[PDB]
Symmetry: D2
């Protein structure tokens, strides 16, 4: 009680009853479970991104607008099916639906476009079809590649080479789908931007009763590395034909978030099912409940104990900002970023505070959806003559969007993360600001 | 040997943090210990045949659930007879005989305020037919449990009452319900209709945590392997759900339509068995034991004091088993509440206690049938030897293993007070 | 490695003790301040210069002995010795002046009222108030200091059973506490003093307020050039307990080896500070420190967390009153807290907080406030390089505010030296 | 119930704390120690403490081990001091409530190899039946082997406590501890051989490693130095004694304080008073957790039984753990887990009864009844002897819970049973 008494008097007992805060203050994991409360409502914005596979059931512009409003952050295009012409039309429809909300950043929502490859088949390396599909991705400006059946580090180097010099900025998320991928996980993660636990093939390649071990291990190692991890396949499977999921399906979604997944995915549920929008809404509702139930006290302590010492100022500032946000129950951490890296380094410490990432790069704004708890804001104004004023305008842009979009209210504390000079790699400042 | 320390997720068990424990989980680290989470299979048209029941017992069914929401008393009495016939077909080999509990799951109160007249009749049927457990539907408060207990009468005092929590009131009045119940069932079917579907996992994890803290059995139920009612293999979400119920701390996992009416009853039991064994090896015992110890209050009860000493001793030597003599199952339950990795082999002469201890995780009941020796110390030794011989035959024990033996200072229940370190010869 | 770093990485306190190494040399500057009692043996300007060089941070004047004329001459000699090093601003060491009252004897005595008035007139920085037994005793001392002594720190001396029992109410209204073991060891059983000491140090560490361990720490050094094994152990254990300051009484006031006693406390404190198990200490201080909406409070925890992440050589903080440095000190960083201040009094008083190294800023003011802040930060860096705290390539954490004036600290910056 | 008053004594509010910092904050000067003093006191016998009458007062004050410093005196002088110790000890054999075994320890003069004088003094120790040797200036494992060889054919049961007095002993500590029965942190010479300001690091490290190895460790020299001439110690001296106990020392020592000082009895009384206070202030929650986590897994039934018995004693706040031991080993393995319950060791070996004083919290009871023909009856008689002695001495009352540790067959090395008994 003494460690929360003054803040309880100031913020109120009602504030400390919401978002599983009594369970968050527990001294043991067992006590944390015992304090979980179905009446404790989630307040924070949903931080785990939803990837929706785009197909016949979710192709139209009108349907895609509903999916964006329901919570879709990443549109996946499965190159195992369809054609280049079919997928290009789906991509154009996604972009049309996304841009229909570009009226003001107080209502704008960026959406990443991901290409999921067919894979190597019986062959041992990049398939000729994968080379053509990866070239298509670069030509159509995809943000992410979900590379199928990655079995070793040279597989991701081959994917990187097929993207050429013009696809240098595309994120490569390696899909682990077999025994070799699990066994060579460390070398694959080292050269990848992130990982997808592709449970469909994994559950056929290894005993079905061992998939949960591979999932928890890969999520834990990705959390330790500070790299995005996606949990995929059959999460809400029954929703392909039914309007409501099973008890095992809601449990699976909640447990993927509690495991530490940055993203959760919908495959047949959105590509061909009868309830694509309802499936997105269900993942959204479960993820908000599960994020509040995360035991941050042990998680943050373990992420600190395991993360090595760092002499990188972006990394040092990120841990200081997350520590400061927990100390004051900050509503948000506003960070200026060019490539998304400063937001990713904040996200790896799993703050409860939303990470509002203000960027001029449309691609970085789409790609940061891979990192849990990062809310991208695309800044469109031309640069101010004085760099310090251009920085301040970008911070104010995040404070006004947050104030008028629920995130922030007058009296809230926010942590602001900036650098000392223009350009990528110079984040080194953390500021505590009171919202007026 | 090095091979021993590579199996049963032992590298992940030695980790200094939960995060490093997850990072060390290995799909090639094979489970060695016997499956400790009990499987409850609901009886119906797909599982009533005496020959089909024999296959389900071999696959791992520990408790047979009779769902009184369907069928007459004549139907349930035939189910009881078929279950008992299949169980007793293995009684000719006492070292391998597996007791199977019979649980009666009530229809419930309906639009009524408390115990239905149908439940009063069904509960009296349960006592008359010797059921071991009652899964009481829609328990909303402590007086619902007292009413179930009263309907069982003086002849049903030994029947275990597991309260099913199926609505908001049951979740909110959980503490008072657990206090008077023998255990709890997280009845997710109705719970997921009574409260928002996205909140069920919070109610499940909370109730399992509180039951683990109280040392009382908790069952995770409904739609765990739902797709297996019509498909031979479950979905990725279903295997995950079963593994996570075990990781949460559930003593039992349940099958409903998967065994009552589906096309794969035996395979659904085999699937729960396979998943539970993998998930039990992945339990982070270092944190779990530490937290259970820290939260368990001080006690002046010798059974409770001996149990924590025996669990601490078992962890110190990597004991293959804790062999406990028990009359009511209580000494085995008090060992089980500390979640030892060592199997708790409970030797009992009570056929009912042998069936009921399946509610406690990691308790393997052995029904001892020999008449008592004239010298009490010799009768205790013969039972301990029966435990060792059954354990060797079933694969729990080998020569050279260390075992912890928990016994008492005089006959009758309530006098457990001794813990002994024994080398298997 | 140096500064007990293998013992610092240990996963348990037991393994930390097992890894302590007599060959692991201390590198960090000595964090625990030394209070030396000034008397016949340590009065001369030449002797005081050697005591400052040996490590004396606070000069204590015991008003139980001497006279106003005697103590005023001791104060003038301390100031003369301190100011003899002012010609080199990058290495100048401020020294606080503390007045220790005679006490109530058999409420606030008339002699204490006169002595407290003397302290205000002579510009003392701290009052060590004798025999504090309740909150109203502190209020009486505060009232006797009047309107001109509002800035003087009151450190309540706990010397009897009532002071121990009413500790919480005394700490609440005091700036800090002194565990006055001489009288405490007569007032309560001698074998219970260590319990009162460890409890008071723990509660002061929890409150983020300075605590002094005092009396008979190196007693045998009054006549002998080397202390006993129990005395070196006592000094090391007071530092390991969490004391912000350690004190010398007869050892410096009347003994034959005043300079050697200061040197011995300095040598032991440096060794003991490196042996502190920061992994458990920081985690416990962090877990127990309440949630806060005060930006100075929030910035301090962020800065200490950042310093541990990069093994920062120092945390450079700008402070008017010393408060921003005190809030960093309460988390016990391994990094030195270099406090750059224009207030000569705050520079002297900040010696009460463990690990705070005060730098008195005497350079011309900049016209642009941002440029003025930058030059005070570069002054912290140049003084740090000269004193051995910093080297080129080191990382430092810089803590500053958004606007001039006290109470506005809200910024933490990661800076690479040179 | 035990009552709220029970939970206010022996620093029990500080014992329940969830952090070490909270534990310190909850220490209470009004919380009185109830348990018997568990840290043995070693007193150096010299001119000021040699007489039978003075030795009787020192035994009553709390002396458990009599140290004879072979750096001074002679064989004749030390033999007379030993005879006086034995006469003073045996003067209490007519009262079970007052009788207490007292170990006799020989501290060598010290050293190329073992000195000629040390060979003769070690032979004197064997001939006079000493229990312990405090071996001066041990620098390496071969120094311990030389002392062991010198203990001739009749003295292999004598305990060798290696004194660490210089840089080489500190640096070769692990190899020395491996072959020694225990260690003495000999701070006098250590504070001359290494910088004085580093002695506390060597002390804390050696105590921690001995606690980890489950071997006795003695903190020695200048603990109450001023009491050689003054009736009361300094604030630094009481602090030093309390901190040696909090560090984890099994024994604390008095040298000039008892050998030649003006207040030998008062110095013993002061160490007794401080140790009792400091033992109650030990943070058992973290200590037991860390001893468990660091101690490797074991297939030795005595070690497995010991941890189970200590866990059981903490669970019920057992007044005592009664253990049957012939060599002292079963009591030593209980002691290494630092139970708050007193370890009452029932033995037929007079030497083991004296030597177990080296292990913190072991209260030896020498049993001299003739053996019963039925072994189970002889075991029950010794268990009841421990219970009746415990009731007589104030350790136990009817209604208390005790833990009893025995083995399954006679002879040393078979401990494998732990029982929970209600005192009737
Ligand atoms: O791009 C698609 C697509 C493209 C063009 C026509 C139909 C589809 C389609 O039905 C579809 C279904 C799915 S799907 O429903 O997720 N699923 C169908 C069965 C096979 C699964 C597999 O790849 O193993 C996939 C998609 O992932 C993608 C598409
Ligand atoms: O101010 C002092 C002083 C002032 C003028 C003459 C002599 C002295 C002196 O000897 C002295 C000794 C000491 S002292 O050595 O610490 N000590 C002497 C004995 C009584 C102790 C007590 O107060 O209980 C104090 C001082 O603390 C201060 C002075
Ligand atoms: O056995 C003793 C003894 C035996 C015969 C005559 C005198 C003494 C004596 O004074 C004495 C003093 C001490 S002592 O007081 O501990 N001693 C003081 C001076 C020498 C020191 C040293 O050895 O470094 C320690 C003893 O340890 C032992 C004896
Ligand atoms: O997260 P990234 O990719 O390193 O970008 C962070 C960068 O953004 C800034 O805050 C502002 O940079 P710009 O003015 O170039 O947009 C820099 O100071 C910092 O280096
Ligand atoms: O677990 P419970 O029901 O308390 O049974 C434990 C009892 O079993 C025993 O070990 C054996 O007793 P019985 O010979 O009566 O079967 C008793 O000593 C002990 O009291
Ligand atoms: O520690 P204090 O007393 O609050 O002083 C800290 C203050 O110092 C500063 O860094 C610099 O202030 P000045 O320019 O007034 O000296 C402020 O921004 C900040 O509020
Ligand atoms: O501690 P030690 O020397 O191993 O002695 C323990 C032995 O004492 C006993 O409890 C009793 O043995 P004895 O009857 O021979 O004295 C044995 O069962 C056990 O092995
Ligand atoms: O490839 C996939 O996405 C899978 O198998 O889940
Ligand atoms: O009754 C049940 O088992 C349920 O609702 O899940
Ligand atoms: O006044 C003091 O310093 C004391 O009593 O210790
Ligand atoms: O020999 C000793 O005891 C010493 O040197 O401390
Ligand atoms: K694909
Ligand atoms: K039912
Ligand atoms: K005074
Ligand atoms: K000697
Ligand atoms: Mg696949
Ligand atoms: Mg139901
Ligand atoms: Mg005083
Ligand atoms: Mg010596």
């Amino acid at each position: 009680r003494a460690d929360v008494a003054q803040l309880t008097q100031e913020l109120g007992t009602a504030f400390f009853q919401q978002q599983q805060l009594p369970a968050a203050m527990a001294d043991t994991f067992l006590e944390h479970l015992c304090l979980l409360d179905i009446d404790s409502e989630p307040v924070a914005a949903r931080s785990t991104s939803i990837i929706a596979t785009i197909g016949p059931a979710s192709r139209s512009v009108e349907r895609l607008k509903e999916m964006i409003k329901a919570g879709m952050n990443i549109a996946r295009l499965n190159f195992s099916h369809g054609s280049h012409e079919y997928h290009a039309e789906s991509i154009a429809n996604v972009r049309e639906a996304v841009e229909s909300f570009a009226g003001s950043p107080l209502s704008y929502r960026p959406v990443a476009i991901a290409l999921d490859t067919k894979g190597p088949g019986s062959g041992p390396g990049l398939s000729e079809q994968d080379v053509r599909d990866l070239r298509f991705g670069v030509e159509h400006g995809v943000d992410i590649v979900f590379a199928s059946f990655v079995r070793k580090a040279s597989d991701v180097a081959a994917v990187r080479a097929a993207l050429g010099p013009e696809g240098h900025g595309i994120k490569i998320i390696s899909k682990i789908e077999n025994h070799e991928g699990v066994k060579r996980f460390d070398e694959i993660l080292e050269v990848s931007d992130g990982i997808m636990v592709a449970r469909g093939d994994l559950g056929i390649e290894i005993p079905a009763e061992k998939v949960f071990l591979a999932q928890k291990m890969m999520i834990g190692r990705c959390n330790l590395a500070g790299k995005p991890v996606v949990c995929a396949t059959q999460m809400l499977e029954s929703m392909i034909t039914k309007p409501r999921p099973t008890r095992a399906e809601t449990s699976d979604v909640a447990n993927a978030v509690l495991d530490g997944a940055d993203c959760i995915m919908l495959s047949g549920e959105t590509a061909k099912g009868n309830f694509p929008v309802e499936a997105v809404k269900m993942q959204h509702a479960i993820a908000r409940e599960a994020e509040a139930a995360v035991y941050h006290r042990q998680l943050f302590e373990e992420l600190r104990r395991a993360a090595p010492l760092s002499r990188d100022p972006t990394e040092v500032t990120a841990i200081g900002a997350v520590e400061a946000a927990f100390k004051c129950c900050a509503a948000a951490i506003i960070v200026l970023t060019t490539t998304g890296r400063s937001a990713q380094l904040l996200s790896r410490y799993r703050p409860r505070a939303a990470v509002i990432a203000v960027t001029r790069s449309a691609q970085a704004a789409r790609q940061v959806h891979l990192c849990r708890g990062v809310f991208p804001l695309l800044y469109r104004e031309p640069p101010e003559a004085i760099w310090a004023d251009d920085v301040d305008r970008r911070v104010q842009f995040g404070i006004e969007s947050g104030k008028l979009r629920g995130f922030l209210r007058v009296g809230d504390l926010v942590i602001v993360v900036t650098g000392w000079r223009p350009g990528s790699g110079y984040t080194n400042i953390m500021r505590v600001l009171s919202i007026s």
